[PDB]
């Protein structure tokens, strides 16, 4: 449905620090890659059982930040905490939120 680069702010101490990843969004699954060639296949999460929320001032929010969180568990699989995503512009945040909603993600 939508593809682009997104920075993940929540990464564990073993690999901590915000990092930019290539993301592919479809109606069925969310697939994250370290490359735009879509070969790494870092981790995947299903579209459903997820919801979109805003974020608090817990990060140096020089970017436009929104969070996709698991409604069944406390964290995203193969990830640290919930998937807080930072965009270069606010339009990217709104576009991604709309894309996730169309894919099947539900509002908080």
CA-to-CA separations, 73 to 1, 27, 49, 50, 108, in angstroms, rounded: 25, 21, 9, 10, 15
- Core vs surface per residue 18-34: b (16+ CB within 10 A) or e: eeebbbbbeeeebbbbe
Q: How was this structure determined?
A: cryo-EM
Taken in order 19, 24, 30, 33, the sign of the CA dihedral is negative
Instruction: Give 55-62's long-range contacts (Cβ < 8 A, gap of 24+).
Output: 55/84, 59/9, 59/84, 59/86, 61/86
Question: Coil, strand or helix: which one is 11?
Answer: coil
Report CA 66 to chain centroid distance, whole Å: 8
Q: How far apart are the first and last CA of the chain?
A: 21
Q: What's the residue count for the chain? A: 108
> At how many Å resolution was this determined?
3.3
Instruction: Give the number of other CB atoms < 10 A from CB of residue 46.
Output: 12
């Amino acid at each position: 449905i939508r593809k682009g680069w997104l920075t993940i702010n929540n990464i564990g101490i073993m690999k901590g620090g915000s990092k930019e990843y290539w993301f592919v969004l479809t109606a069925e699954n969310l697939s994250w890659y370290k490359d735009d060639e879509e070969k790494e296949k870092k981790y995947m999460l299903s579209v459903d059982n997820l919801k979109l929320r805003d974020v608090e001032k817990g990060f140096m929010s020089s970017k436009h930040i929104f969070a996709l969180f698991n409604t069944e568990q406390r964290n995203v699989y193969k990830d640290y905490r919930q998937l807080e995503l930072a965009c270069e512009t606010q339009e990217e945040v709104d576009s991604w939120k709309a894309s996730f909603l169309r894919a099947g993600v539900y509002p908080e």
